[PDB]
Amino acid sequence: IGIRLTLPPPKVVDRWNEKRAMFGVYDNIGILGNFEKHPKELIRGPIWLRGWKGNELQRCIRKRKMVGSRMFADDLHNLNKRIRYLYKHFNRH
Amino acid sequence: LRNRVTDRYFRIQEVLKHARHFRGRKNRCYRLAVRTVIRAF
């Protein structure tokens, strides 16, 4: 019980697929490109998490600030509650 | 990334292999076995 009686389908990873083969290219766009672009501009992802890092409280504050007005009612309510919860937690209340 | 133990079976067998010759449920139920095995050791 709790352990599979057969082997899982063998894992076949293509190490030389286009994505892996070109990983890291242009990470030096600034150093080698007259600093016209900064490497952080390459980053794809949430508008509020591009070239920026923080703890969960800081992320929630940042997300509400940048996209809070565009959030769905229930999501925004959860975010507001989370920030208040995290504010007490991170400040040792 | 969610991580779950997948080899718990082998962890339990390490205790149980020392309890086979015990009497009663001590010889197969891990929670009972472990305590008796610890006393044996």
Binding site: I3, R4, L5, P8 | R4, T6, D7, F10
Partner: peptide
């Protein structure tokens, strides 16, 4: 179904030992 390979492979070797003991080859 738990993702992973090492535990399943180890248990396969365990089962093979029993398959040998249950039917000891000639």
């Amino acid at each position: 179904v738990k993702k992973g390979f090492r535990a399943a492979f180890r248990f396969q070797k365990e089962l093979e030992r029993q398959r040998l003991l249950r039917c000891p080859p000639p």
